[PDB]
Amino acid sequence: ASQLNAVVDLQDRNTELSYQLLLDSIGDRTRYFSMWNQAVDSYDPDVRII
Amino acid sequence: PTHDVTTDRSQRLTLRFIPVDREDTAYSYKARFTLAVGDNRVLDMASTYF
Numbered sequence: 001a002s003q004l005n006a007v008v009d010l011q012d013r014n015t016e017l018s019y020q021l022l023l024d025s026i027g028d029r030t031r032y033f034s035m036w037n038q039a040v041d042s043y044d045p046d047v048r049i050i
Numbered sequence: 051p052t053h054d055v056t057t058d059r060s061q062r063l064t065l066r067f068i069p070v071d072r073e074d075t076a077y078s079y080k081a082r083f084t085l086a087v088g089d090n091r092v093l094d095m096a097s098t099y100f
Contacts, residue, residue, distance in 0.1 A: 001086045003066050 061091075 009015075023029055023038065032039045073080035081100070087093045 001084070002062075002088065003068060004062065 029040050030042075067083045067085065069081040070084055071080075071082045085093075085098070
């Protein structure tokens with residue numbers, strides 16, 4: 001009707017990091033969900049720290 | 051004048067209208083809009099343009 005845009009997006013917002021930290025809080029982040037390609041970046045602890 | 055001239059509610063000056071239906075003929079181009087004038091508003095069509 002008006003095409004009043006409900007999305008006011010700012011450059012100093014970080015939507016991606018706000019969603020990576022969100023899935024940490026509301027779920028077991030170690031689990032793999034192929035539909036959202038939800039597979040967290042994880043190093044090997046014997047490779048980082050010898 | 052301070053009263054009964056300009057509103058104090060939420061209302062845009064310029065609205066953007068995207069075509070509901072369009073057609074790209076080989077010699078013409080049709081664009082059909084919804085020119086929705088909201089409640090308690092007036093639109094002089096001289097301010098309207100494509």
